[PDB]
Design an enzyme around this catalytic site. Structure first.
Site, PDB file in Angstrom:
ATOM      1  N   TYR A   1      -8.741   7.189  12.427  1.00 19.35           N
ATOM      2  CA  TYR A   1      -8.025   7.687  13.594  1.00 19.35           C
ATOM      3  C   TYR A   1      -8.878   8.469  14.581  1.00 19.35           C
ATOM      4  CZ  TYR A   1      -3.377   6.314  12.013  1.00 19.35           C
ATOM      5  OH  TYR A   1      -2.265   5.592  11.646  1.00 19.35           O
TER       6      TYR A   1
ATOM      7  N   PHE B   1       1.503  10.362   2.954  1.00 20.22           N
ATOM      8  CA  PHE B   1       1.897  10.243   4.349  1.00 20.22           C
ATOM      9  C   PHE B   1       2.475   8.885   4.713  1.00 20.22           C
ATOM     10  CE2 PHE B   1      -1.001   7.474   6.729  1.00 20.22           C
ATOM     11  CZ  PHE B   1      -1.937   7.191   5.757  1.00 20.22           C
ATOM     12  N   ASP B   2       2.236   7.851   3.914  1.00 18.74           N
ATOM     13  CA  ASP B   2       2.733   6.516   4.214  1.00 18.74           C
ATOM     14  C   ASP B   2       2.724   5.694   2.937  1.00 18.74           C
ATOM     15  OD1 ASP B   2       3.583   4.158   5.288  1.00 18.74           O
ATOM     16  OD2 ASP B   2       1.766   3.750   6.447  1.00 18.74           O
TER      17      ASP B   2
ATOM     18  N   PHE C   1      -5.730   5.052   0.246  1.00 17.89           N
ATOM     19  CA  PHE C   1      -4.701   4.027   0.131  1.00 17.89           C
ATOM     20  C   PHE C   1      -4.773   3.340  -1.225  1.00 17.89           C
ATOM     21  CE2 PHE C   1      -5.808   4.314   4.642  1.00 17.89           C
ATOM     22  CZ  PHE C   1      -4.573   4.582   5.194  1.00 17.89           C
TER      23      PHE C   1
ATOM     24  N   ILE D   1      -5.908  -0.659  11.283  1.00 19.10           N
ATOM     25  CA  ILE D   1      -7.069   0.220  11.390  1.00 19.10           C
ATOM     26  C   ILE D   1      -8.270  -0.381  10.669  1.00 19.10           C
ATOM     27  CG2 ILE D   1      -5.858   2.378  11.815  1.00 19.10           C
ATOM     28  CD1 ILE D   1      -5.885   2.874   8.806  1.00 19.10           C
TER      29      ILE D   1
ATOM     30  N   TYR E   1       0.824  -1.195   0.000  1.00 14.08           N
ATOM     31  CA  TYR E   1       0.000   0.000   0.000  1.00 14.08           C
ATOM     32  C   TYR E   1       0.862   1.251   0.000  1.00 14.08           C
ATOM     33  CZ  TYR E   1       0.951   0.951   4.944  1.00 14.08           C
ATOM     34  OH  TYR E   1       1.559   1.249   6.141  1.00 14.08           O
TER      35      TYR E   1
END
Lengths: 386, 756, 315, 107
Positions: free
Chosen positions: D82, D36-37, D99, D56, D26
């Site tokens: 979150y 961000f990731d 994602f 999550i 991902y």
């Protein structure tokens, strides 16, 4: 212990008044302290009489004298030159430390703070002009800048001074948002945070929030970042609380500072074909062509494989079509002078819009696309696999 | 484009400063922020920035430092901390480097061979944010160390190739920006436990060939070069020590059975004479330290040498090999040549660089000094306790990192957890020598002084941290015989701030005064070496506590008695532990303590000494009635009557134990008679017998925080050590008044026994 | 335990000689400023960097020792004296006398390993009647009018070491029954006699030649605000060590037996007292009426009376 | 709250089941496209269990609706990813995540 001396008649045989010569450096420093405290008390009385209520202009307000005195005191506390003899530089450093200690031990920093408060009670130079006069309103900015420079120079090298007046950090950071002496206040904060570790123990979350809001308001200034670095690490030791506060309140939304990415280089190819419409001579205003693909990896190295196809306009009847300048992530559809299609979305102005289609997917291998374009009434169109 | 910032001066400087901020916000062992900054910049953008040739240079240095801080600095600092500690196992891999190749025309390359030494385990958690509630995120962000290794190797080769030709545009700008960040990355990589023999050979193939030390490098580059060479000599010294231990294993293994065989031979061919029992007492006594001390001395013609002369030749061969491997009569030679050449080229600025160069030159010319400085710190343990020692070293490194960072709530909690770990590590029991070699007490004392700094008597910030430190130090001094001597030096410090932790009957253990008492406890040599630069401070503290009201009980609600009996009790306990050891009274310590107590009369109780209260009788009856009426207390609580009683009992016990003797020396010495007369003038005999005769109640259980028989026990001890029982009249008198009621009360017991 | 013993008594037994060659190839101007001169300037800048306490400075403690050990029938005597003078020239033409003076002045009069190494270097640089180094030191002290050097010397002479009898009695009581350690380090009775004799030999070498100027500068530092009498400090320390020797004799008066600890303490006391007397002789030698009157108007007569008494009785 | 947009079909035959260590790849990004990731950066996949309360909800409930070799765009909401507190340092309060979930292997 305070043994008050009393002059009596008989006297006792145990006084023993030994003398110490009071080195000329210390004597000059003390007389300078006296002159400066006298002039500053005069200026404070004048400004207090002017601010508390309207009074007669027949008051002692030596604007020019206090400006000259600040200019002299800044040079008095000026640090020695780094390109000098080591021994003479150390002597000048010791003399500067002695002068700073003498000025601190006579109640001068609080005097400067009082002058700074009585100067900041006014909002702007225009607001000060109608109350004090043309020259005072003209040079109030210079006086404030010189006062902040003197406050910074008094505390630049010394450590006891910072550890002593560190309690005024709340007032300093509160005045930090005066929009006028921000540079001086930030310099004072930096030189008081770089030396005294006592100062970092009273910097709470509100002060860091205020400094970050200052960075958000006044723009991109590296002095704010240096102050934040000093807050994170003072002397070879880290402050986990301050570091966590910085990490939480400085870069949560990525808009406070610059961002960075690692993007790919995209290329725009075309045939020697130009399609323009006008009155009279036209080109039937209808065109079409096809697409196949041989091999296409979904992710070559690290990111999604950019692959779009479409129609790009120009600047009227000239070459050099749309795009920002070149070599960026701008393919087709990434601006208003281009319209592209990537298999799943439609790109027009760097804004992708999703569409519906039977078996919708990206331009994978063995995908036959067909691009048609009518010019006058309708617009371009794409057909995936027929 | 990020490369467009070469001309824009604002964005260039601002991005350099924000890279410095990214570095400073997670410089030390703060991994919760590194786990964020990794993704906030990128994973492979760091590689791309250190990899790109076209860079402004400020951004290049910033990205290099950012990579170092968020991916390698934690383990680099861990190894730099636990780098001077040469902990060796006893596995067979240790006995494989017994050759340490130096003969047959070879010296070897520094860093090549086998380590087989206790080193902190490295591990890097995988940065993932979709994983909610990560386990610990405490070790480090993960990085492709092998890819970074290959990249930095090829880039160092390319950089030295470019610098050999002296181009007009080195990477990033100046040769400083070209070399300093790259060689810093290479240095921290070599530190962090990579560059195995394969890659290390290739690395040495650009500095060794006789290169990088021959170029005209600026000051910031040669500083990192000196650091690299210092590490290259540190690993060589470590290899030397490993070889020393490897040879020492087999040498002492032979010597132990040799001496056991000679002992058995003496046992068989005893042949009784006068010197035989002398040899027997020599073998039984003379602990192994001086035994080895005697059996290892042969450099002159003749001295005390045992029978095994055959192992002496092997020892001489090993020592000669060691001396020829050391600097005495090529790496040391080339380093020396480079240092002298750099010093002769031109006048050198950067006094830090000058100092580094000169210490490197000095250690290269000395060679043995590293050995005499590091052998006191090396220690071999076992091949079975390796994981336990690894856990101990990891907890010690955590404690050191927590010492480096500032003190807070989370830091205090982590330090307490680390102290508990090193106390329950099960190796602290077995090997205290290793504990002194590592210097655990040193770091704990540093933590304690950092916690105590800031306040003298107003408020002690971060409580219970000094408590955990003092408890660890108490136990460290307790399970030992020489850790007490090692800690006795810090006693002179901790006695000044010994006033903290008192006036609170919740920590009878952890306290600076209590760790002092534990350091002097049960050690005649320390009790004798305890001179009086601090006994006077102790009596001054006792006088202050006996005069003032400690300003702590009036806040809780106590009736504000004109003297504090809770701090005086602890002070008298420390004085007793310092004056009475192993069952005998230290003569000179008792003398000086009596001198101080008689010169300062306010150390005694106000109701016993002075122009007010009559004496001990009235004092302790008043104490009993204060204990009985709850109107004179603080509304677990401190019973004021009980406190006064134990204070007076502790004072009487201290006086009785500081009595000259039980008359062995007093039968012939005059100062003993003078001290006994002073004690008798202080405490009369009628007072003593009246205090003994109280006939405490013996109960349905009761409370043990009142009048306990320990008071009358201390009274009996004082009476026996000062007055004694020698005449029939007083003997029968005392037996009738005090002893019969107590013995009858102790005999009146069938099943309900609550007061032992 | 084997490794501890090996570290203790196998390796540090004078197994190297490199100080002379090191100083030589550091003073060689390979080509400016020599490396040894750069090191001396570094030490001087470190000593002149004003602080509150002289740091440990393992660098300086390791290099002063080397520079001190580098130094040291008529033709061979003259030749060895000339060689000693040549070595002293080699390592003091670069400003090592100023370095020693600055390091002594930057200690505020507090006994430490830095001061010990600096006094060893001063002794090795003033061995013999070297007048060039004495003149350099005097010119430096006169052109930089500082009293810190003199008050540091006074503090060192006042708090260097004195014999005590209480510590000796405690050591005797300890060794009487305690066999766990044998108390092999005979300290706490005369703290650092090496440092004491080194300081007094440094003063003796400062006044080695009949330098009337230096002998008067050590008495009245003309040109400075406050002056301290090094002569009076020396005679006071002599009185103190005389009283200590008298007390130690009173202790060892009656048993007629001197153990090895007693003999070693006697020998250390005798060496310290002999160094003090040699310093006083070098102070008063020549027609120096200033120092002569200073010694005649002090407690020197009581000290010499006690010394005569202890001499007669002990002999 | 959790949704899915098919990016490349993965034959729609094998689906992740309860009690398996699924292998995903991902790259995440915020609502405004700011990354961000990701997992393609460190060149290693992400192995996670389904129904073990470790990943999550907006990710696990979206990955439970995919097939082997399938690519999808998973869009989340704050209450599922979150919450109002976000991730300290990385995710701002009330931020919707996106994602590129690509399914590699099923174990």
């Amino acid at each position: 212990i305070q043994r008050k001396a009393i002059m009596h008649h008989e006297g006792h045989m145990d006084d023993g008044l030994n003398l110490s010569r009071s080195q000329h450096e210390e004597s000059r420093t003390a007389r300078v302290i006296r002159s400066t405290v006298f002039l500053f008390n005069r200026f404070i009385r004048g400004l207090d009489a002017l601010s508390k209520k309207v009074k007669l202009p027949t008051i002692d307000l030596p604007i020019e004298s206090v400006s000259l005195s600040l200019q002299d005191l800044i040079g008095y506390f000026h640090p020695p030159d780094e390109h000098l003899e080591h021994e003479d530089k150390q002597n000048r450093l010791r003399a500067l430390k002695n002068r700073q200690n003498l000025f601190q031990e006579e109640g001068m920093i609080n005097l400067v703070l009082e002058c700074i408060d009585r100067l900041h009670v006014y909002s702007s130079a225009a607001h000060f002009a109608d109350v004090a006069g043309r020259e005072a309103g003209e040079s109030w900015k210079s006086i404030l800048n010189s006062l902040y420079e003197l406050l910074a120079a008094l505390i630049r090298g010394n450590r006891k001074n910072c550890a002593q007046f560190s309690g005024s950090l709340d007032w300093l950071i509160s005045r930090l948002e005066r929009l006028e002496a921000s540079s001086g206040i930030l310099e004072v904060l930096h030189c008081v945070l770089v030396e005294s570790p006592e100062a970092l123990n009273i910097i709470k979350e509100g002060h860091i929030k205020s400094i970050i809001s200052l960075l958000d308001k006044h723009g991109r200034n590296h002095k704010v970042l240096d102050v934040l670095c000093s807050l994170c690490v003072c002397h070879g030791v880290a402050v986990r609380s301050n570091q966590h506060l910085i990490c939480d309140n400085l870069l949560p939304g990525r808009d406070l500072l610059l961002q960075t990415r690692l993007v790919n280089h995209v290329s725009s190819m075309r045939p020697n074909i130009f399609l323009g419409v006008s009155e009279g001579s036209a080109q039937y205003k209808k065109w079409y062509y096809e697409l196949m693909v041989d091999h296409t990896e979904p992710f070559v190295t690290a990111e999604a494989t950019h692959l779009r196809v479409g129609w790009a306009s120009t600047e009227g009847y000239s070459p050099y079509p749309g795009g920002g300048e070149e070599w960026g992530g701008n393919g087709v559809g990434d601006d208003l002078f281009s319209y592209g299609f990537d298999g799943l979305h439609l790109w027009s102005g760097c804004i992708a819009r999703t569409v519906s289609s039977p078996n919708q997917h990206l331009l994978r291998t063995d995908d036959v696309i067909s691009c048609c374009l009518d010019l006058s009434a309708p617009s371009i169109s794409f057909r995936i696999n027929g | 484009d990020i490369l467009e910032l070469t001309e824009q001066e604002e964005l260039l400087q601002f991005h350099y400063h924000t890279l410095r901020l990214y570095s400073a916000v997670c410089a030390l062992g703060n991994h919760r922020v590194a786990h964020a900054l990794c993704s906030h910049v990128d994973e492979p953008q760091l590689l791309y920035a250190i990899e790109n040739k076209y860079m402004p240079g400020l951004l290049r240095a910033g990205y290099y430092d950012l990579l170092i801080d968020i991916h390698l600095s934690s383990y680099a600092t861990a190894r730099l901390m636990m780098n001077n500690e040469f902990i060796v196992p006893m596995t067979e891999e240790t006995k494989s480097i017994t050759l340490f190749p130096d003969e047959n025309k070879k010296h070897g390359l520094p860093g090549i061979g086998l380590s087989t030494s206790l080193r902190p385990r490295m591990r890097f958690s995988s940065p993932s944010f979709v994983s909610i509630s990560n386990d610990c995120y405490q070790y480090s962000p993960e990085f492709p160390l092998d890819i970074l290794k290959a990249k930095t190797i090829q880039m160092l080769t390319e950089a030295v190739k470019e610098g050999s030709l002296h181009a007009r545009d080195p990477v990033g700008g100046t040769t400083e920006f070209l070399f300093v960040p790259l060689i810093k990355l290479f240095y921290t990589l070599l530190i962090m436990g990579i560059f195995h023999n394969e890659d290390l050979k290739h690395i040495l193939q650009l500095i060794e060939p006789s290169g990088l030390l021959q170029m005209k490098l600026p000051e910031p580059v040669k500083l990192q070069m000196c650091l690299l060479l210092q590490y290259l000599c540190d690993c060589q010294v470590r290899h030397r020590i490993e070889a020393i231990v490897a040879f020492s294993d087999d040498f002492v293994a032979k010597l132990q059975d040799n001496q056991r065989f000679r002992y058995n031979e003496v046992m068989q061919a005893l042949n009784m004479s006068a010197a035989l029992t002398a040899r027997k007492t020599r073998e039984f006594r003379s602990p192994p330290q001086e035994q080895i001390n005697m059996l290892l001395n042969f450099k002159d013609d003749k001295s005390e040498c045992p029978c095994p002369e055959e192992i002496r030749d092997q020892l001489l061969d090993f020592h000669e090999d060691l001396m020829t491997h050391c600097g005495i009569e090529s790496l040391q030679q080339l380093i020396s040549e480079t240092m002298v050449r750099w010093a002769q080229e031109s006048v050198i600025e950067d006094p830090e660089l000058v100092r580094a160069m000169f210490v490197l030159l000095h250690r290269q010319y000395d060679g043995i000094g590293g050995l005499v400085r590091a052998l006191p710190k090396t220690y071999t343990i076992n091949g079975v306790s390796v994981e336990d020692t690894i856990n101990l070293l990891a907890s010690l490194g955590q404690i050191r990192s927590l010492l480096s960072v500032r003190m807070g709530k989370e830091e205090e909690k982590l330090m307490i957890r680390g102290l508990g770990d090193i106390m329950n590590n099960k190796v602290f029991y077995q090997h205290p020598n290793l504990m002194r070699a590592l210097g655990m007490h040193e770091t704990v004392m540093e933590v304690m002084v950092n916690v105590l700094g800031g306040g003298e008597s107003k408020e002690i910030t971060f409580p219970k941290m000094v408590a955990n430190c003092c408890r660890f130090l108490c136990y460290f001094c307790r399970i030992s015989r020489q850790n007490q001597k090692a800690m006795f030096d810090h006693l002179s410090y901790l006695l000044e701030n010994s006033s903290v932790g008192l006036a609170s009957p919740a920590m009878r253990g952890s306290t600076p005064l209590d760790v002092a008492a534990a350091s002097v406890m049960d050690n005649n040599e320390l009790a004798l070496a305890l001179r009086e630069p601090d006994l006077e401070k102790v009596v001054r503290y006792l006088a202050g506590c006996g005069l003032q009201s400690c300003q702590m009980l009036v806040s809780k609600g106590y009736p504000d008695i004109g003297w504090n009996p809770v701090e005086g009790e602890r002070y008298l306990d420390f004085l007793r532990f310092a004056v009475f050891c192993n069952g005998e009274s230290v003569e000179e310590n008792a003398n000086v303590v009596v001198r101080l107590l008689i010169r300062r009369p306010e150390c005694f109780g106000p109701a016993l000494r002075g122009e007010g209260g009559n004496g001990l009788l009235a004092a302790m009856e008043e104490a009993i009635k204060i204990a009985e009426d709850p109107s004179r207390d603080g509304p677990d609580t401190i019973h004021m009557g009980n406190a006064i009683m134990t204070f007076y009992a502790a004072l009487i016990d201290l006086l009785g134990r500081c009595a000259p003797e039980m008359h062995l020396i007093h039968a012939g010495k005059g100062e003993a008679i003078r001290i006994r007369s002073i004690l008798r003038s202080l405490i009369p005999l009628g007072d003593l017998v009246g205090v003994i005769s109280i006939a405490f109640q013996m109960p349905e259980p009761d409370m043990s925080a009142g009048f306990c028989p320990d008071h009358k026990a201390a009274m009996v001890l004082f009476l026996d050590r000062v007055y004694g029982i020698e005449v029939q009249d007083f003997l029968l008198h005392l037996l009738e008044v005090g002893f019969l009621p107590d013995l009858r009360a102790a005999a009146s017991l069938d099943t309900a026994a609550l007061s032992x | 335990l084997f490794l501890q013993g090996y570290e203790k008594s196998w390796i540090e037994t004078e197994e190297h000689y490199f100080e002379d060659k090191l100083i030589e190839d550091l003073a060689k101007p390979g080509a400016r400023v020599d490396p040894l001169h750069q090191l001396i300037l570094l030490f001087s800048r470190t000593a002149l960097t004003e602080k509150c306490k002289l740091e440990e400075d393992f660098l300086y403690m390791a290099y002063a020792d080397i520079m001190a050990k580098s130094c040291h029938s008529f033709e061979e005597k003259e030749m060895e004296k000339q060689k000693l003078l040549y070595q002293q020239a080699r390592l003091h033409d670069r400003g090592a006398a100023e370095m020693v003076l600055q390091t002594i002045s930057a200690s505020k009069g507090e006994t430490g390993p830095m001061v010990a190494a600096t006094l060893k270097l001063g002794i090795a640089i003033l061995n013999g009647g070297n007048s060039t180094v004495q003149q350099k030191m005097l010119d430096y002290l006169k052109e930089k009018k500082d009293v810190g050097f003199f008050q540091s010397l006074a503090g060192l002479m006042q708090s260097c070491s004195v014999l005590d009898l209480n510590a000796f009695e405690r050591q005797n009581k300890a060794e009487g029954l305690g066999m766990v350690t044998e108390e092999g380090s005979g300290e706490k009775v005369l703290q650092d006699d090496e440092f004491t004799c080194d300081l007094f030999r440094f003063l003796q070498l400062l006044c080695e030649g009949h330098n009337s100027d230096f002998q008067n500068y050590l008495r009245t530092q003309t040109g400075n605000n406050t002056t301290v009498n090094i002569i009076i400090s020396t005679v006071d320390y002599l009185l103190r060590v005389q009283e200590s020797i008298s007390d130690f004799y009173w202790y060892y008066s009656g048993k007629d037996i001197i153990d090895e600890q007693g003999q070693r303490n006697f020998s250390k006391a005798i060496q310290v007292a002999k160094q003090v007397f040699n310093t006083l002789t070098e102070y008063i030698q020549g027609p120096c009426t200033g120092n002569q009157q200073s010694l005649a108007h002090s407690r020197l007569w009581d000290a010499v009376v006690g010394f005569l008494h202890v001499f007669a009785h002990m002999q | 709250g959790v949704e899915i947009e098919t990016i490349s079909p993965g034959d729609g035959r094998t689906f992740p089941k309860k009690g398996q260590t699924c292998v995903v790849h991902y790259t995440g990004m915020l609502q405004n496209g700011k990354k961000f990731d990701s997992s393609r950066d460190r060149n290693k996949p992400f192995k996670f269990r389904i129904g073990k309360q470790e990943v999550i909800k907006g990710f696990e409930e979206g990955a439970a609706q995919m097939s082997l070799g399938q690519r999808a765009k998973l869009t989340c909401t704050p209450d599922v990813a979150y919450g109002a507190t976000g991730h300290p340092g990385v995710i701002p309060p009330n931020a919707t995540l996106i994602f590129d979930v690509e399914l590699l292997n099923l174990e």
